[PDB]
């Protein structure tokens, strides 16, 4: 194959240069499990037992015993497949555009296949990370003109049946009001018996800067960040708490546990960018190529994610 398909050989050499996604930091190693498909749906069944009555004493002779029931729930996860096309130079045509310092046509914005693929892969990965955190696909900084997606395709920010808190516009700078809502949201969380788990916090940089201020007269030797860490530790049974900063978020705080039993990420094994065998070729030096990637595979339990939105109006 590598003796026949130059483009396949080029991708194999250049695949190591693509950087790992930042979404890996948002999840524990145990929370991510690969599945095997490209487009469609999968079903997961969770079995739970229950006690139907008080236990019975084993005294003398008896044959009437209490019963233990069972029940199951099934959750359907929708996947999707998307593709992008990019132009580049034909392999035989590179030698006629090689220069002492670079290869390519500067005037017409044409690259060798290896360079174009690496840049195109990086752009796709950024869009992948945006969807995982936000649940939406868009290329506008305004966030409008979103691509309509399938049902049962949610991200962390748009997962339904989760706790959402809104900070009023007038209190957007009042850190005390912000912490008031967070505590109320932390109260409404329902972790069941899995509360003894590490937690993860994601904040936009603007909120991150507000946190590093000294904790409020005023005090010292303590920051708003540490106050948040203690408050979260009150509900996770004094477990570890991690904080991360993502430029993708805007005036929003995300809190969710790091237990696979509550939130699990099950993406396709072909989610990351993958080259396509179809390569358009003409009489000129311009060729076209396609890259494929798969979206979907986030599963979470009801009322286990806290979403604080700071209204900047």
């Amino acid at each position: 194959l590598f003796d026949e398909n130059y483009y396949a050989k080029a991708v194999a050499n250049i695949i190591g240069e693509v950087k790992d996604p930042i979404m890996y930091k948002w999840f524990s190693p145990d929370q991510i499990e690969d599945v095997d498909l490209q487009m469609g749906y999968q079903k997961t069944v969770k079995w739970d037992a229950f006690l139907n009555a008080n236990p019975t004493t084993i005294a003398n002779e008896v044959n009437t015993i209490s019963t233990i029931g069972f029940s199951s729930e099934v959750v359907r996860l929708n996947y999707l497949k998307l593709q992008y096309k990019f132009r580049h130079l034909k392999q035989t045509s590179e030698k006629f555009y090689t220069s002492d310092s670079y290869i390519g046509d500067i005037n017409n914005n044409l690259l060798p296949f290896a360079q174009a693929y690496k840049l195109a892969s990086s752009e796709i990965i950024k869009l992948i990370n945006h969807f995982v955190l936000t649940g939406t696909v868009s290329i506008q900084k305004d966030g409008k003109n979103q691509k309509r997606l399938l049902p049962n395709m949610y991200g962390l920010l748009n997962m339904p049946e989760q706790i959402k808190e809104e900070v009023a516009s007038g209190d957007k700078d009042k850190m005390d009001k912000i912490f008031e809502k967070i505590e109320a949201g932390l109260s409404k969380l329902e972790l069941g018996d899995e509360f003894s788990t590490p937690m993860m916090v994601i904040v936009d940089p603007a909120t991150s800067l507000k946190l590093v201020k000294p904790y409020a007269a005023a005090s010292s030797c303590e920051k708003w960040e540490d106050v948040l860490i203690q408050t979260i530790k009150a509900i996770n049974n004094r477990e570890d708490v991690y904080i991360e900063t993502s430029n993708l978020l805007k005036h929003k705080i995300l809190i969710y546990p790091l237990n696979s039993e509550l939130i699990k990420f099950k993406p396709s094994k072909y989610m990351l960018p993958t080259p396509n065998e179809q390569v358009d070729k003409d009489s000129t030096d311009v060729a076209h190529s396609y890259i494929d990637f798969v979206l979907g595979g986030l599963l979470a339990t009801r009322k286990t994610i806290l979403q604080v939105n700071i209204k900047q109006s």
Partner: protein
């Protein structure tokens, strides 16, 4: 088209209301780690206490007699069981299978303890209950002796499950 989809969802919900274990696809996992009050559901088949020497009979049924008192109806096909009470009561349906349309029923000669459908929420503990014409338990001329162990618990708009022990017929 969308209106047809909405009407289809409405009728599907209405049909699934009268079902033992309706199959639904949900986007999230419901969490019920608390082990208390996890047994009062419409899919809890059988009884709270079950003996190895209990007599179970499977019969073809008409309608939905699940968790209701049943009576034999003769019509050509074999006789079936229909949800009903009064003096015609033959047994109580404790399990159902919709694929084969077969109801598993305990005869009236065998005592039972379990959750059954009640007419309304006016039933308290230590109350004498009678099976009505629809096979539902209503507060009290009782041919059988059924006493409520708990109070009526509501799950759906009309679903009322009450824990009752039935131990034969009166005189």
């Amino acid at each position: 088209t969308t209106q047809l989809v909405k009407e289809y969802q409405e009728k599907r919900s209405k049909l699934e209301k009268f079902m033992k274990n309706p199959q639904h696809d949900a986007s999230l996992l419901s969490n019920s780690n608390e082990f208390r009050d996890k047994n009062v559901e419409f899919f809890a088949s059988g009884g709270t206490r079950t003996s190895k020497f209990d007599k179970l009979e499977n019969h073809p049924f008409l309608g939905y007699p699940y968790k209701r008192g049943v009576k034999r109806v003769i019509q050509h096909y074999e006789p079936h069981v229909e949800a009903g009470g009064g003096e015609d009561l033959y047994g109580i349906c404790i399990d159902i299978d919709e694929f084969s349309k077969t109801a598993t029923i305990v005869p009236i000669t065998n005592n039972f303890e379990g959750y059954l459908v009640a007419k309304d929420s006016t039933v308290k503990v230590k109350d004498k209950l009678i099976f009505n014409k629809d096979g539902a338990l209503e507060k009290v001329k009782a041919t059988i002796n059924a006493t409520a162990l708990t109070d009526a618990k509501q799950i759906s708009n009309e679903v009322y499950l009450v824990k009752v022990a039935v131990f034969g017929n009166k005189a």
